[PDB]
Design an enzyme around this catalytic site. Sequence first.
Site, PDB file in Angstrom:
ATOM      1  N   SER A 194      23.336 -22.631 -19.587  1.00  0.00           N
ATOM      2  CA  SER A 194      22.794 -22.121 -18.330  1.00  0.00           C
ATOM      3  C   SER A 194      23.916 -22.073 -17.278  1.00  0.00           C
ATOM      4  O   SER A 194      24.961 -21.475 -17.535  1.00  0.00           O
ATOM      5  CB  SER A 194      21.563 -22.949 -17.915  1.00  0.00           C
ATOM      6  N   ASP A 248      15.099 -15.010 -23.265  1.00  0.00           N
ATOM      7  CA  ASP A 248      15.593 -15.746 -22.105  1.00  0.00           C
ATOM      8  C   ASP A 248      15.153 -15.030 -20.828  1.00  0.00           C
ATOM      9  O   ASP A 248      15.590 -13.907 -20.584  1.00  0.00           O
ATOM     10  CB  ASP A 248      17.120 -15.792 -22.165  1.00  0.00           C
ATOM     11  N   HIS A 293      14.281 -20.149 -22.203  1.00  0.00           N
ATOM     12  CA  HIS A 293      15.259 -20.921 -21.423  1.00  0.00           C
ATOM     13  C   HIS A 293      14.874 -22.402 -21.359  1.00  0.00           C
ATOM     14  O   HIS A 293      14.594 -22.949 -20.290  1.00  0.00           O
ATOM     15  CB  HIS A 293      15.430 -20.326 -20.012  1.00  0.00           C
TER      16      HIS A 293
HETATM   17  C1  LIG Z   1      16.443 -22.443 -11.261  1.00  0.00           C
HETATM   18  C2  LIG Z   1      17.025 -22.354 -12.665  1.00  0.00           C
HETATM   19  C3  LIG Z   1      18.473 -21.850 -12.705  1.00  0.00           C
HETATM   20  O1  LIG Z   1      18.609 -20.598 -12.021  1.00  0.00           O
HETATM   21  C4  LIG Z   1      19.104 -21.939 -14.091  1.00  0.00           C
HETATM   22  C5  LIG Z   1      20.411 -21.186 -13.886  1.00  0.00           C
HETATM   23  C6  LIG Z   1      20.713 -20.071 -14.691  1.00  0.00           C
HETATM   24  C7  LIG Z   1      21.861 -19.299 -14.460  1.00  0.00           C
HETATM   25  C8  LIG Z   1      22.722 -19.703 -13.323  1.00  0.00           C
HETATM   26  C9  LIG Z   1      22.388 -20.801 -12.544  1.00  0.00           C
HETATM   27  O2  LIG Z   1      23.218 -21.107 -11.552  1.00  0.00           O
HETATM   28  C10 LIG Z   1      21.240 -21.544 -12.825  1.00  0.00           C
HETATM   29  C11 LIG Z   1      20.813 -22.655 -11.945  1.00  0.00           C
HETATM   30  O3  LIG Z   1      20.841 -22.037 -10.653  1.00  0.00           O
HETATM   31  C12 LIG Z   1      20.694 -22.839  -9.470  1.00  0.00           C
HETATM   32  C13 LIG Z   1      21.965 -22.728  -8.644  1.00  0.00           C
HETATM   33  C14 LIG Z   1      22.148 -21.269  -8.242  1.00  0.00           C
HETATM   34  N1  LIG Z   1      23.482 -21.182  -7.628  1.00  0.00           N
HETATM   35  C15 LIG Z   1      23.776 -21.768  -6.541  1.00  0.00           C
HETATM   36  C16 LIG Z   1      24.390 -20.556  -8.261  1.00  0.00           C
HETATM   37  C17 LIG Z   1      20.974 -20.868  -7.341  1.00  0.00           C
HETATM   38  O4  LIG Z   1      20.896 -21.679  -6.170  1.00  0.00           O
HETATM   39  C18 LIG Z   1      19.694 -21.026  -8.170  1.00  0.00           C
HETATM   40  C19 LIG Z   1      18.435 -20.689  -7.365  1.00  0.00           C
HETATM   41  O5  LIG Z   1      19.578 -22.362  -8.691  1.00  0.00           O
HETATM   42  C20 LIG Z   1      19.308 -22.951 -12.014  1.00  0.00           C
HETATM   43  C21 LIG Z   1      23.950 -18.921 -13.050  1.00  0.00           C
HETATM   44  O6  LIG Z   1      24.754 -19.273 -12.156  1.00  0.00           O
HETATM   45  C22 LIG Z   1      24.240 -17.750 -13.916  1.00  0.00           C
HETATM   46  C23 LIG Z   1      25.382 -17.001 -13.669  1.00  0.00           C
HETATM   47  O7  LIG Z   1      26.185 -17.327 -12.658  1.00  0.00           O
HETATM   48  C24 LIG Z   1      25.686 -15.905 -14.468  1.00  0.00           C
HETATM   49  C25 LIG Z   1      24.843 -15.572 -15.517  1.00  0.00           C
HETATM   50  C26 LIG Z   1      23.700 -16.326 -15.777  1.00  0.00           C
HETATM   51  C27 LIG Z   1      23.380 -17.433 -14.975  1.00  0.00           C
HETATM   52  C28 LIG Z   1      22.220 -18.183 -15.238  1.00  0.00           C
HETATM   53  O8  LIG Z   1      21.492 -17.846 -16.204  1.00  0.00           O
END
Ligand SMILES: CC[C@]1(O)Cc2cc3c(c(O)c2[C@@H](O[C@H]2C[C@H](N(C)C)[C@H](O)[C@H](C)O2)C1)C(=O)c1c(O)cccc1C3=O
Length: 297
Positions: free
Chosen positions: A101, A247, A275
Site C-alpha cells: 500500500s 483492489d 485491499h
Molecule cells: C485510507 C487508506 C489508504 O489510502 C491506503 C493507501 C493506499 C495508497 C497510498 C496511500 O498513501 C495510502 C494510505 O493513505 C493515507 C495517506 C495519504 N497521503 C498522505 C499520502 C492520504 O492522506 C490518505 C487519505 O491516507 C491510506 C498512496 O500513497 C498511493 C500512491 O502514492 C500511489 C499509488 C497507490 C497508492 C495507494 O494505493
Amino acid sequence: SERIVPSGDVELWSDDFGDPADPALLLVMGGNLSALGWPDEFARRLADGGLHVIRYDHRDTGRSTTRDFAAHPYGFGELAADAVAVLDGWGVDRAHVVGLSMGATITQVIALDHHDRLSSLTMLLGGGLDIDFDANIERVMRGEPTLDGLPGPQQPFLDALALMNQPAEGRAAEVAKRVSKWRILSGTGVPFDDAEYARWEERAIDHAGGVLAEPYAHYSLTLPPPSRAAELREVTVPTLVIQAEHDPIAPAPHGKHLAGLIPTARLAEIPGMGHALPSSVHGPLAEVILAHTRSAA
Ligand SMILES: CC[C@]1(O)Cc2cc3c(c(O)c2[C@@H](O[C@H]2C[C@H](N(C)C)[C@H](O)[C@H](C)O2)C1)C(=O)c1c(O)cccc1C3=O
C-alpha cells in the site's frame, strides 16, 4: 524476538519470525499501520518457507516514537531511512523488502536512495511514484479524471473513509469498526473471516498499549514529486509487483504501470483479492514472494 532500534531522533519497535540465519525479508506496512498490520500468521507462513522475516512499527504507530507531526514534520525520505535503520538494527546488509500500500511508495524510495541495501523488491496494493494519489482522491470525489489516466480509488475506498469517520465507543466497538473497514476493502472475491480479522485488530490494539485510536500522523505526509518515477529506470534488483485483482484503492492496471517503471520488474496478479490480507490469500501471496526471493539468491 523483539527489539527497539535507533533511527536518528526516533526509536522503532521491531520483531521477527523464522531462523535468524535465513535470508532477511523486511515487511513494510501501509500508512498508519503498525507491525501488527502484518498478521502474525502471514509472517509465519512466509518465514516457514526459509526466510528471516522482520517487521516493525513506522514512527507514529505501535510502540515507535509518536510525536506531534506539526512540530516535527517528516516525509517519505525519513520513512525509507527508518526501514533501512531497522535493517541496521538487526545487522542485515541486504534484505528482500516487501512494501504494501503506502509502503510500496516507501519501498520505491528505498530502491532509489538505499539500493545498496536490497536483495530484491516486492510491492503490492500500491502504485508508481508518478501517481499523484492524494490529488486523485480529490479528483475522484469531484468526478474529474486522474492526470495519469489510470483508475483512481473506487467506491469501496470512499466507503471505508466514511466508516472511519463514524464514532466507536469502547474496545469491542472499535474492533468491530476496524473489521468492518477491512471487510469493505477486501471485497468478496476471496473469503473474508471476521473472527480472524477481529483477533488481528485485538492484537494490534494490545500492541499499542490498549489505546483505541488509530494512528493518524501519516495523513499529514506529502508524497515524493512525480519526477522521481523516472529514476526507477536505474533499479537493478529483482522486482516483483503484485496486483490484487479487485483492489479498490489501486486498481489494475496500477500494477502493470508500476512494473513498467522498473526494468527488472515482473508482474503477478492474485485472483479475487482486495485491499486486505485475509488468510485466504496468505498461501498464494507467500508462494509468489518465496518464488521471487529464491530467484534473487
Ligand atoms: C485510507 C487508506 C489508504 O489510502 C491506503 C493507501 C493506499 C495508497 C497510498 C496511500 O498513501 C495510502 C494510505 O493513505 C493515507 C495517506 C495519504 N497521503 C498522505 C499520502 C492520504 O492522506 C490518505 C487519505 O491516507 C491510506 C498512496 O500513497 C498511493 C500512491 O502514492 C500511489 C499509488 C497507490 C497508492 C495507494 O494505493
